């Protein structure tokens, strides 16, 4: 339990000053809740922030607190940006561990889309009981220019998420897209293919070739699920590769087979999935480039659709 917790006045706040609300999620050995910090910025001692806290679940063992430690280090390292999930402050004293970051009210960018949809022919159903106001094209566009922007930023930093989909983005009050869960350290075991997150995911869909086959991981491994992240965006929210299983994946791949350009999207932008999903890591194109695209595109990009 004792375990020596490093201290960072700068990130230090006391327990008393934060009060934890409702669960947001569950992950390995570690689980998320809503919480409201009082007192986040110190010359600003009365003021409530909404923020999200992960501690470690009642199975949590040794290896789980040093993933922890190791993420919030990570996110220290990696400094702020607008487009990530941003690190706050972190409780170190007096108890259990909390890392305290930025909220994202309106979810992960995956329920965002499909609450979303419009009904037609363009795009599947809503399966929101609660559907919202539908987006233009200029905020699709503009979605995607956002993640790349965080993107672009986490690889300056050098960071590699290695699974980027969808719901590893999140989204604010405001509307603004943030990635998520890209401080996370690499298993030095093998990875089951087959095997579904918490959610009933299969990421082998939005890996590289080299990282599906080889394994290997490397910031083009990242812009090829950027590409499946595009597609996903312009399907508001659709199942990459419907029906086919991983065993189907691993030759179409090898044969060159990609998916279909989405019902509802422009020839630029599926230029622009097909060239992240281009078997050769090194003619993808970068997250900077793709960022110098994409808000050249949003600008061309009307509203009004
Ligand atoms: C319709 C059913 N839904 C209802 C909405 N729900 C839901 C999902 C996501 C959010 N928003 C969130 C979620 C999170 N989560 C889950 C979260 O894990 N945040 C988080 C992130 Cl992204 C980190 O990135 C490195 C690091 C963290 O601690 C080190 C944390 Cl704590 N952080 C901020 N906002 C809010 C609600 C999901 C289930």
């Known amino acids: 339990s004792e375990y020596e917790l490093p201290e960072d006045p700068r990130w230090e706040l006391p327990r008393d000053?934060?009060?934890?609300?409702?669960p947001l999620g569950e992950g390995a050995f570690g689980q998320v809740v809503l919480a409201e910090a009082i007192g986040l910025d110190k010359d600003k001692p009365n003021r409530v922030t909404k923020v999200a806290v992960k501690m470690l679940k009642s199975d949590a063992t040794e290896k789980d607190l040093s993933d922890l430690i190791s993420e919030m280090e990570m996110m220290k390292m990696i400094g702020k940006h607008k487009n990530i999930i941003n690190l706050l402050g972190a409780?170190?004293?007096?108890?259990?561990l909390y890392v305290?970051?930025?909220y994202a009210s309106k979810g992960n960018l995956?329920?965002?889309?499909?609450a979303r949809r419009p009904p037609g022919?363009?795009?599947?159903?809503?399966?929101?009981?609660?559907?919202?106001?539908?987006?233009?094209?200029?905020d699709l566009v503009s979605c995607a220019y956002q993640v790349a922007?965080?993107?672009?930023?986490?690889?300056?930093?050098?960071?590699?998420?290695?699974?980027?989909?969808?719901?590893?983005?999140?989204?604010?009050?405001?509307?603004?897209?943030?990635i998520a869960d890209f401080g996370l350290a690499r298993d030095i075991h093998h990875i089951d293919y087959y095997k579904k997150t918490t959610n009933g995911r299969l990421p082998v869909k939005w890996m590289a070739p080299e990282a599906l086959f080889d394994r290997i991981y490397t910031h083009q491994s990242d812009v090829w699920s950027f590409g499946v992240?595009?597609?996903?965006?312009?399907?508001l929210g659709g199942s990459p590769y419907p029906g086919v299983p991983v065993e189907e994946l691993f030759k179409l791949l090898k044969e060159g087979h990609r998916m279909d350009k989405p019902s509802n999207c422009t020839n630029e932008?599926?230029?622009?999935?097909?060239?992240?999903?281009?078997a050769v890591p090194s003619q993808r194109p970068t997250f900077k480039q793709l960022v110098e695209d994409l808000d050249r595109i949003v600008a061309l990009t009307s509203n009004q659709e």
């Open 121 to 138: 022919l363009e795009y599947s159903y809503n399966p929101s009981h609660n559907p919202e106001e539908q987006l233009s094209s200029k």
């Open 17 to 22: 000053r934060l009060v934890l609300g409702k």
């Open 149 to 178: 922007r965080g993107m672009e930023y986490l690889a300056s930093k050098k960071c590699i998420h290695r699974d980027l989909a969808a719901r590893n983005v999140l989204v604010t009050e405001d509307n603004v897209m943030k």
């Open 229 to 235: 992240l595009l597609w996903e965006i312009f399907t």
């Open 110 to 114: 995956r329920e965002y889309l499909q």
């Open 91 to 96: 409780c170190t004293q007096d108890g259990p």
């Open 269 to 278: 932008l599926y230029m622009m999935m097909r060239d992240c999903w281009h």
């Open 100 to 102: 305290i970051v930025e």
